[PDB]
């Protein structure tokens, strides 16, 4: 009979005090509004929309949640935009300008010496 | 460079994470000095005060075993965390050699774009690299050909691409648009123009031929 | 693993006795949770290396070369390629649980096909900025220059080179 | 490897197969990745002075 972890999804107490709850790999008919069944368990307190955004809070199996539409919502993350290269057997694109960009990269080298 | 200063002044999570990990482990080590592990108390001055020596040995051993276990768990997890810090420092030492004392050709090793140069900055337990790269922008399409046929010969560009603005044929360099007249100084010849597929007909200009005459 | 349910397991005489050991079970759950969070970052770092989801053009004719065995198969729920289909056919308890990955492998196949269409259509320009189209024969000729061969060696041997690629 | 053999051309010896690296293609496997490396291999040499 059923056991599983319980997870709490929060947008952060500095945004809201609403909460959603994931019962992990539990069938959503034996948990004890919005009850939504996922490949990762039963989600309570978030509504499922049909849009697709960039992932915010990862639920699992392709499903993420966000505080947008407020409250908490579910959906399937977005891999990225959509670019369509106009490829042909005799076409080329050549740049006419440039930008100088500078970015950062942070790396740990040491930790504390304890005895 | 002025925007790095804003974005930081207003991100160092990888450095914060290793500090937090070590403190969370050192606190768990001390918080274990107050568990019984199956004894009458957690204090040796309480087992040495309400038990005779033959009975306090059995209760002291239960504490010794637990505390040894906890200390040895602490020492294993530090070996496993140090082996990970070591690989990060080995990567930082390679980036200092290859991005700061050189120009790298490896893709996405010293930023995203074409690496120009890198600058190091020290951080609390690590290093920040500022990567300066070139990014091309504002592209146009033209039409291309692989070679040009002229006088029954096939001409290929020495270091560029043949392009057409609609009616005329030029040579550019491949990353920046700067068209030039096709001459025998920026092309070379090999073969006749019936084996390449895509050749176009156009004139290749000889600089000596007019000037001399 | 649920430390308490693996050790004791239902009984109640065991939970109060195990409570005497301190935070041994909290440490183990932290250790296992870190591992599971690292497995998704592994996959994000290998596969989500692309800004846009690029598509190949319909005509699908790159100066000859034939990529049909490694481009996605439109007649499938998973949309994998022929070689990705070959590769995928060759490989509850006492507190134990298996979590699912954040990315489905439909999503992973969709990242890989976009990396493929970026390469076949733009060469190496999409890895440094915006994708700039170039014909495939001319990109192959740029690459022959990179290994120190002169680029008419490609254009005068295009058919043979394309046949050798296709057989390999 | 995905950065340096798929998004570019490598001059590092043996990092992307045997031969002179031309290009590389990725495929997804279960819990892994497969790289198909295309390389150029010289053949049929003659001797000269
Ligand atoms: C190349 O891009 C730069 C921008 O990076 C252009 O320079 C800008 O021009 C606009 C309009 O003249 C000005 O408002 C900006 O102040 C300029 N930017 C800088 C940093 O000076 C430049 O004109 C572009 N060149 C071409 C040929 O298009
Ligand atoms: C290069 O030319 C192509 C061909 O028209 C352009 O791509 C088309 O752009 C229009 C308008 O943005 C779209 O509606 C088409 O779907 C595009 N693809 C086609 C027609 O296959 C492209 O904009 C041009 N690139 C530049 C930099 O000017
Ligand atoms: C392609 O570029 C050429 C530039 O060489 C253009 O032709 C010249 O255009 C200028 C200004 O319109 C005229 O003064 C010249 O007489 C033209 N010919 C030459 C030989 O210089 C041509 O118009 C461009 N074509 C397109 C479609 O933009
Ligand atoms: C490129 O130029 C060559 C030579 O000027 C053209 O070859 C001639 O083509 C016409 C029409 O097909 C024939 O009647 C002649 O006999 C050809 N002469 C030779 C020497 O081959 C060629 O057709 C041109 N290419 C294009 C696309 O116009
Ligand atoms: C690309 O190669 C494949 C082979 O892997 C070609 O598909 C086969 O073509 C032969 C005849 O050329 C048929 O007998 C096979 O039944 C085909 N296999 C299939 C369709 O799975 C394919 O035609 C090639 N592409 C092009 C454009 O020629
Ligand atoms: C180039 O010439 C050398 C000889 O100078 C060839 O090596 C000889 O190969 C033959 C046949 O296998 C052997 O019997 C000789 O003993 C070899 N010479 C030595 C000094 O060992 C080599 O095979 C030739 N290669 C080509 C491409 O012609
Ligand atoms: C956190 O709270 C402070 C002040 O209440 C606010 O300035 C900040 O934007 C908040 N952060 C988020 C993420 O909302
Ligand atoms: C939960 O149980 C019901 C009743 O048998 C079943 O229809 C449903 O499919 C179960 N949940 C899942 C995810 O299969
Ligand atoms: C999402 O789209 C599907 C299309 O099959 C539709 O059946 C469903 O009702 C939509 N969901 C919502 C919440 O509108
Ligand atoms: C390009 O394709 C067109 C079809 O629109 C064909 O007529 C032409 O011969 C092809 N040229 C090359 C160089 O492949």
Chain B residues touching A85 at Cβ < 8 A: none
Note every long-range contact of C22-25, with CB atoms under 8 Å and residues 24 or more positions apart, other chains counting: C22/B31, C22/B32, C22/B34, C22/B35, C22/B37, C22/B66, C22/B70, C23/B28, C23/B31, C23/B32, C24/B70, C24/B73
Q: In the structure, do chain A and chain D come into contact, i.e. share 3 or more CB pairs under 8 Å?
A: no
SS3 C161: helix
User: Ramachandran region of residue B25, left (φ > 0), alpha (ψ -120 to 50) or beta?
Assistant: alpha
The pairing of strands B200-201 and B161-164 is: unpaired
What is the experimental method? Answer: cryo-EM
Question: Which of D3, D7, D12, D24 to probe by mutation at the B interface, max B CB count within 10 Å?
Answer: D3
Q: Which atom of ligand 10 is nearest to the CA of A89?
A: 1
Q: Tell which residue, A12, A16, A40, A10, has the closest CA to residue A28.
A: A40
Nearest to C129 among B70, B113, B198 (CB): B113
What CA–CA distance (Å, rounded) separates A19 from C72?
Answer: 40
Question: Which of C40, C69, C87, C106 to probe by mutation at the D interface, max D CB count within 10 Å?
Answer: C87
SS3 D40: strand
- In this complex, do B107 and C137 lie within 8 Å of one another by their Cβ atoms? no
Q: What is the least distance, in Å, from the CA of A4 to any CA of chain B?
A: 27
Chains that touch D (3 or more CB pairs under 8 A): B, C
From chain C residues 89-148, the ones with a CB under 8 A of any chain D CB are: 91, 105, 108-109, 111-112, 115-116, 119, 124, 126-127, 140, 143-144, 146-148
Q: Which atom of ligand 5 is nearest to the CA of C66?
A: 1
What CA–CA distance (Å, rounded) separates B182 from B157?
Answer: 9
What CA–CA distance (Å, rounded) separates B151 from B204?
Answer: 9
Sheet holding B187-192, edge to edge: B187-192, B153-157, B148-150, B200-201
Give the per-residue SS3 of C10-31.
CCCHHHHHHHHHCCHHHHHHHH
Of the bound ligands, which one is closest to the alpha carbon of residue C155?
10
In 10 A of CB D30, how many CB atoms? 12
What CA–CA distances, in Å, run from B144 to A90, B153, C30, C160, C165? 5, 18, 59, 23, 24
What CA–CA distance (Å, rounded) separates C8 from C20?
Answer: 13
- For residue D48, give every residue at least 6 positions away whose Cβ sits within 8 Å of its Cβ, in sequence order, or none: none
What CA–CA distance (Å, rounded) separates B73 from B85?
Answer: 19
């Amino acid at each position: 009979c059923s056991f599983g972890g319980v997870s709490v999804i929060t947008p952060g107490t500095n945004t809201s005090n609403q909460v959603a709850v994931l019962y992990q790999g539990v069938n959503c008919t034996e948990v004890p509004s919005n009850v939504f069944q996922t490949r990762a368990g039963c989600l309570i307190g978030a509504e499922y929309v049909n849009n697709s955004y960039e992932c915010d809070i990862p639920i699992g199996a392709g499903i993420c949640a966000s505080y947008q539409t407020q409250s908490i919502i579910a959906y399937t993350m977005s891999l990225g935009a959509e670019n369509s290269v106009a490829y042909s057997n005799n076409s080329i694109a050549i740049p006419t300008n440039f930008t100088i960009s500078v970015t950062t990269e942070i790396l740990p080298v040491s930790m504390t010496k304890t005895s | 460079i002025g925007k790095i200063q804003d974005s930081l002044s207003s991100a160092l999570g990888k450095l914060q994470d290793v500090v937090n990990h070590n403190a969370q482990a050192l606190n768990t080590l001390v918080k274990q000095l107050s568990s019984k592990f199956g004894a009458i108390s957690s204090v040796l001055n309480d087992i040495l005060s309400r038990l005779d020596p033959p009975e306090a040995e059995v209760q002291i051993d239960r504490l010794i075993t637990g505390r040894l276990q906890s200390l040895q768990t602490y020492v294993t997890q530090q070996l496993i965390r140090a082996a990970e810090i070591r690989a990060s420092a080995n990567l930082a030492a390679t980036k200092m050699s290859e991005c700061v004392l050189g120009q790298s050709k490896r893709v996405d090793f010293c930023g995203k774009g074409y690496h120009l140069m890198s600058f190091p900055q020290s951080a609390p337990h690590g290093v920040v690299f500022l990567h300066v790269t070139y990014v091309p922008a504002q592209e146009k399409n033209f039409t291309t050909a692989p070679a040009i046929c002229h006088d029954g010969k096939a001409h290929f560009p020495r270091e560029g691409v043949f392009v057409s603005n609609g009616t005329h044929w030029f040579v550019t360099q491949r990353n920046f648009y700067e068209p030039q007249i096709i001459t025998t100084d920026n092309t070379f010849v090999s073969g006749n123009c019936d084996v390449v597929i895509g050749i176009v007909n156009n004139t290749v200009y000889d600089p000596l031929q007019p000037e001399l005459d | 693993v649920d430390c308490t349910m693996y050790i004791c397991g239902d009984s109640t005489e065991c939970s109060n006795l195990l409570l005497q050991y301190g935070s041994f079970c909290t440490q183990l759950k932290r250790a296992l949770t870190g591992i599971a969070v690292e497995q998704d970052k592994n996959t994000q770092e290998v596969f989500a290396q692309v800004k846009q989801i690029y598509k190949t053009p319909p005509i699908k004719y790159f100066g000859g070369f034939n990529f049909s065995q490694i481009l996605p198969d439109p007649s499938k729920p998973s949309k994998r390629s022929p070689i990705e289909d070959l590769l995928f056919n060759k490989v509850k308890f006492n507190g134990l649980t298996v979590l699912p990955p954040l990315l489905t492998d439909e999503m992973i196949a969709q990242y890989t096909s976009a990396l493929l269409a970026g390469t076949i259509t733009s060469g190496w320009t999409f890895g440094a900025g915006p994708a700039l189209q170039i014909p495939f024969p001319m990109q192959m000729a740029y690459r022959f220059n990179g290994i120190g061969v002169t680029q008419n060696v490609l254009y005068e041997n295009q058919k043979l080179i394309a046949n050798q690629f296709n057989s390999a």
